[PDB]
Ligand binder design. Structure first.
Ligand SMILES: [Ca+2]
Ligand SMILES: [Ca+2]
Ligand SMILES: [Ca+2]
Ligand SMILES: [Ca+2]
Length: 144
């Protein structure tokens, strides 16, 4: 249902294209951000456009917005999947996965590990050496 898909993307684009000329400029991007409680500098506004402007003409057109929007979507889907799985491991939602927590989910996965085996797993991902795995350390282990 691309047709319906493009429609939703067109809708998003129009929010930024304040004057409707078919392009988004630094100033238009600027008014959108400011309405969000963010007052970026012209320098920051230029870096944002630079990242998305494939033909280097200085503005973003629909096709350029579409391709970036897409790639961004895919990525937002990744993050929320990993964040979901983090919540399942962090049985007490304290923000960190302990040895005991990791060992209990592992048994549920069909792997009966000893405390020493779980401790080794934690150690491998434990960057701040606090004996637990935080989200940052979890994504590192996940992705990498
Ligand atoms: Ca415009
Ligand atoms: Ca462009
Ligand atoms: Ca926890
Ligand atoms: Ca840690």
């Amino acid at each position: 249902l691309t047709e319906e898909q493009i429609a939703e993307f067109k809708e998003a684009f129009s929010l930024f294209d304040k004057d409707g000329d078919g392009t988004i400029t630094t100033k238009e991007l600027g008014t959108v951000m400011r309405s969000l409680g963010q007052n970026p500098t012209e320098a920051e506004l230029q870096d944002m456009i630079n990242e998305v402007d494939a033909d280097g003409n200085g503005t973003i057109d629909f096709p350029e917005f579409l391709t970036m929007m897409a790639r961004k979507m895919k990525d937002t889907d990744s993050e929320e999947e990993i964040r979901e799985a983090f919540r399942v491991f962090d049985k007490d939602g304290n923000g960190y996965i302990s040895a005991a927590e990791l060992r209990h989910v592992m048994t549920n996965l069909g792997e009966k590990l000893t405390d020493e085996e779980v401790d080794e797993m934690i150690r491998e991902a434990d960057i701040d050496g606090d004996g637990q795995v935080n989200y940052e350390e979890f994504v590192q282990m996940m992705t990498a």
